[PDB]
From a paper:
Insects, instead, rely on a distinct family of sweet gustatory receptors, which are tetrameric ligand-gated cation channels. An extreme example of sugar specialization occurs in a conserved subfamily of gustatory receptors founded by Drosophila melanogaster Gr43a (DmGr43a), whose members are selectively activated only by the monosaccharide d-fructose, providing a unique opportunity to investigate how specificity for a single sugar is achieved. Our results thus indicate that receptor tuning in BmGr9 arises from two distinct but complementary mechanisms: the stereoelectronic characteristics of the ligand-binding pocket; and the engagement of an allosteric process required to activate the channel.
Consistent with our docking results, our data show that l-sorbose binds BmGr9 with an affinity close to that of d-fructose whereas sucrose did not induce a shift in the tryptophan fluorescence spectrum. We therefore determined the structure of BmGr9 in a third gating state bound to a non-activating sugar, l-sorbose, but with a closed pore. As other hexoses are predicted to make many of the same contacts as d-fructose, it is unclear why they do not activate BmGr9. d-Fructose and l-sorbose differ by the chirality of a single hydroxyl group at the C5 position. In the pocket, l-sorbose makes many of the same interactions as d-fructose: a hydrophobic surface (hydrogens of C1 and C3) faces Trp354 and the hydroxyl groups are all coordinated. However, l-sorbose does not interact with Phe333 of the aromatic bridge; therefore, there is no link between l-sorbose in the binding pocket and the pore helix, leaving the ion-conducting pore in a closed conformation. This structure, with a bound ligand but closed pore, illustrates how the structural changes associated with ligand binding may be uncoupled from those leading to channel activation. Indeed, our structure of BmGr9 bound to l-sorbose reveals that non-activating sugars not only can fit into the ligand-binding pocket, but also can make many of the same contacts as d-fructose, yet the pore is closed.
Author numbering:
A (entry chain A), B (entry chain B), C (entry chain C), D (entry chain D): 14 to 229, 270 to 275, 281 to 445
The structure:
């Protein structure tokens, strides 16, 4: 029983397995999947990302070498720099995601066996309807992004068909669009890992609340409590320490990809609206281009949202536990042994909090999204008014 | 006895009832009002806001279709975009306020029965003079805003009278001004809900201070304490947990309207001073327009103030309770049972604080107003100097 | 024995008494001063500030009415607005300082009798050398500012002597320079109130440290401790609550003047360097003007420094007390009664901190000065490069 | 036994001794170095920095007096100001570093004898491989910076060889490059002091974790614990107070140099990329200049990194100790004496944290680097688009 992953979190692992983002071996168990590191998939991931980055660099160099008048996507001087910056930031995100995948997956195996212990202690997990909805949402995001990628690729390939270099665009941007797909899969993988962790934290909060109600190794019954509240509070304190450790492991594993993703999102939310506005004020003459630019703006916003939303939900659960603990304290006999257990839990809550701080650069939550959007508007207002 | 609301908070509920912002049934009790959800008022609110938004969109489209030279309000290219942005942000604020009203009102019924329990425990509320002053202030704000709306509508209708399209302006902006009224009523409703909660918190602080003095279900006497301080401190700890729950419920109910209101306030505090300055530097030729622009700048500032002031007062009360608790700790016998109750209260104060964080985006307080005004000036200085 | 103020804090009270900033009656006691509110000085302050503001407004209107070519100080279009903004912000600062003085002085009497109790408990205060140095520093700042005001007034009066309107400049700027003097005196008064409070906090920290050492109503001996450490820690906890109350009273009394002072400092640190640079790049032709502009830039920086430095020192003392308390905890018998007193003191330190937050807008400390200077440079770089 | 310093921290002390940044006497002990203040080295440092600053000022004045067309480095009007600003900020950094060195070294002796006590208590330190790697890294940074300085000096001396004033560039920039070397040595000295402190904190965390495991004056065995966990926790609480004191001493000693270094880094990260881009867009004609500009951009980034990275590692250790303490609390008998010791340690952790706040202006960590880089990009985008 190496890891025994399952649910919607295990669905993106299979999807990420073919993108180089989860070099694991999946052994069916008719209930879950026993995942372990495979060296063959690690080597495949390494060679795939290396080939994709090499092809992306070669296409970026070739499109520069085609020229300004001959090339369709990058037909200016700032256009060449903006296109190169977009291509390179996407390539760097994909390379960070795939080259760091096997170590990330070992860390995943560790905190996932920890989560298996916690889930055995708490008792079961969410219903199959919730995981089906989560799988549907992940598949919807992936398919929407893939459809956008295919549409944009076909549009730019058909635009160069007038010049006759239709296959040149394919050769120069196939790796770029593959790296886009890889980046999206990496974002979704992190988001669903964080969402499964937040589900565990929600179960912990429910168990603590049931300890509060005191209706009166399978700590929970379904709710109902199968142990005295004093024992339950200590077991839940240990479980919360385990959950904090798992959250820290996830943050350590995804900190560099998360920071690169945030930087890429800032860059794209600056550049895409800029040229979308530039195409509008000067002369449209292209409905498909404007549609694609709006869709890409929404795509970058959705990328930022799927990065920062599970962290916000985790922090919200970490505040709900404090509210529950305060209501716990106001109840129970004053000088009883339950009160001292709740005091230990209070010290735990004050000392450590379950949050995400990728690389220590910032905190992943809603205020970060406000700061990024405030900076994007500041840059856009400065840049647009110059033209 | 469903809810039994009363005071100045219940005055805006009747006013909001006709705007679609409080679909409740009011049953008189000669002392308070027993409010409950009515499906007929919910349907009326839905159809009213839908009709108003449809009319607003139709008028915005028609004014665009009139043209640049023919239309009076939006007679440029950036003017059409600025006018559309203002109209759409007002419509979105009103739609968020009215479409989310019935759920907001159910949450209101819940935390209001909780507040009724708390007020029975503490004992009575503020005098009738205070609620009369609050009603006077709310009515003053509402009537000032309505007078400004009517004046602005009449001014822009008379401006188009020279061209002959006086009724066109009416048809294209009636729904816009109705949505302005709805937005103001929603802001006032939130402000007075928060103010009533802050009044309850002030009563709690007074009770805790009376426990400190120890002059020696009607916990308070008037002040005087009718129970031993040890019992009073535990009852007050429970009451403070209830007040925190009620504050969180209010924040959850109003988070989306509050965020949309703040965004609209930022947009308006950017655009209104910009065109007010533009009219001044180039050529005035219009005293009424400049008067209306200054009045609208003050109106947007007052909107931000009525949003962020009750939250600041609530946070100030939440700090006063900490000061009172510290002075409590320094008194009382050192190893007594009162000291341990005060320690539990200290843990409660450290773990949770009574504040407002709409949607988790930010914190509603004075520093947020400073940040918004700092961003507005940064945008204005950049934009004005370009011209 | 109404208040019994003394030291360098009582020196600025006499100076502020003639500026309308301290309408108190000073009764000598050969050791300190028994200060109390006098209605005659309150009326004198009111009429003086009203007359000064009326004269300032009249001079500002007259200088506008003189014209652009005829007037020397404001000889442009932006110059008239910048001059008016400077004059009006100085007038508003002086009006807030003087109109709010009597209530501020009643609050001062309250927390000063509290401080007298604390100082009797701790034992004496700092030596006469320290208060002499503080008086020398305050007098140096006041005399430097007065010399700058007189020099600037004489320079601008002599500049208009060529046109012949030498007395017009006097008539139009006498009240302006008087209000400058009043603003400086108000800043110094707040700074020395905060400095005396920080001295009391430093004495408290020394007493706590002496409790730590345990060398073994005159709690302190000089150091030495005259009471058992358990009693001393409780008395010091009460004293720290009193000091927190006094700090909050000072912040409440000076919050509006402090916020207006910070806004005026931001405005002046924007406008003075702007025109100093503008005079340099275009054509100097005036050494005295550039010298005065540099001196005014340094003056505004010194204003910000004297506002934010005593608050920083107070916060530094509030951190030193936490360090001392931690070292206290690591010592003493583990389960003794002293440990529980130190635990109560720890709860006090965690719950409340001695700082300054004027009006709740911000926190007065070094980071605020960094934020203000960062905004000033951002505005200056944007504005200067446009020219 | 005055101080007994050793390791990679003692290597930069000898290097800084000849730069005026560590006026100490080194007495060999075959295991460590007994360092003490020497007045001769203090006087040498003072005269050396005074001579270097005098020569730097004279060269800056002479290069201005050469002219615009004749001078090669500063051949414009903004170039003269930018060059003067760079030279003066480097000179100010070097002067702050060297003039404040002897007091900094006395503080170093104090907290270093404290660290010797702590290291005797914990037991030994890291292996010789780690200190050899640290010495290699410091030497690599120093030699890379020296090679860049020599290359840049030779390039600018050879550029003036065409005009014939080859020795004029030497005379005008020798002191400038010497001050650059001094600034780099000061940065490395602070970085390695902070790194040695973080190593001590890591040893403390390991000891606390071993107390957790309870395998069962040489508190640690190697791991293993030679004392009961209750005694070990109290000794570790005292050690953590000592480490906090040492961190505060280091921050006090280096606060002014750190703030000046951060300001210089901001200025250089603004100006160097600006002129690097300006040389690119207009006309390159100079590969060596662009190579040097890119190398200087990377150098300034590395300066910021070596300033802010050891502080980030220290804060990371200070969070790891909280995680370890929480896991400690969840274990151990509930009402035992070990639990109360852990509670005292929790109060210590909550009250004080091991971090760096130079002068109180800001906090040295990763978010500060993000804020600086965000401001640099904002200034660069505004400035570049103007041209
Ligand atoms: O084709 C991909 C892409 O370059 O299309 C253009 C968009 O502006 C950009 O954000 C996006 O990455
Ligand atoms: O008539 C309403 C309105 O458009 O009038 C013009 C003001 O600038 C704007 O803020 C306001 O919403
Ligand atoms: O004479 C006062 C004053 O206007 O002089 C000119 C300075 O720029 C300004 O800061 C100062 O207030
Ligand atoms: O020679 C040193 C220097 O002036 O070279 C030019 C670089 O732009 C600058 O950062 C650097 O300090």
């Amino acid at each position: 029983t190496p890891c025994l992953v399952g649910g919607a979190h295990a669905f993106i692992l299979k999807i990420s397995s073919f993108c180089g983002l989860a070099p694991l071996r999946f052994e069916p168990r008719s209930q879950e999947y026993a995942v372990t590191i495979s060296k063959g998939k690690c080597f495949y991931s390494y060679i795939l990302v290396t080939f994709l980055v090499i092809c992306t660099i070669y296409g970026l160099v070739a499109e520069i070498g085609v020229g300004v008048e001959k090339s369709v996507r990058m037909s200016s001087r700032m256009s060449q720099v903006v296109s190169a910056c977009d291509i390179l930031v996407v390539a760097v995100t994909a390379g960070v995601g795939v080259y760091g995948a096997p170590a990330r997956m070992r860390t995943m195996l560790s905190y996932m066996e920890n989560i298996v212990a916690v889930d055995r202690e708490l008792g079961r997990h969410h219903s199959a309807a919730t995981e089906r909805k989560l799988c549907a949402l992940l598949l919807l995001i992936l398919l929407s992004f893939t459809i956008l990628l295919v549409d944009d690729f076909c549009f730019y390939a058909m635009q160069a068909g007038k010049t006759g270099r239709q296959w040149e665009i394919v050769t120069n941007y196939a790796g770029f669009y593959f790296l886009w797909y890889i980046v999206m899969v990496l974002e979704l993988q992190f988001a669903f890992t964080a969402l499964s962790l937040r589900a565990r934290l929600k179960l912990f909060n429910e168990a603590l609340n049931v300890t509060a109600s005191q209706v009166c190794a399978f700590v929970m019954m379904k709710p109902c409590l199968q142990v005295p509240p004093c024992e339950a509070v200590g077991r839940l304190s240990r479980m919360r320490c385990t959950l904090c450790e798992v959250t820290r492991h996830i943050a350590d594993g995804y900190g560099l990809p998360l920071v690169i993703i945030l930087m890429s999102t800032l860059l794209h939310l600056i550049v895409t609206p800029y040229f979308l506005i530039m195409e509008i004020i000067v002369s449209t003459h292209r409905l498909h281009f404007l549609v694609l630019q709006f869709l890409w703006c929404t795509t970058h916003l959705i990328r930022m949202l799927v990065v920062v939303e599970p962290c916000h939900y985790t922090i919200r659960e970490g505040k709900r536990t404090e509210d529950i603990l305060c209501r716990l304290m106001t109840l129970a006999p004053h000088g009883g042994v339950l009160s001292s257990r709740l005091e230990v839990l209070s010290r735990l809550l004050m000392l450590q909090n379950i949050s995400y701080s990728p690389l220590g650069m910032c905190t992943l939550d809603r205020p970060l999204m406000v700061t990024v959007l405030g900076a994007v508007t500041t840059y856009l207002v400065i840049l647009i008014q110059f033209q």
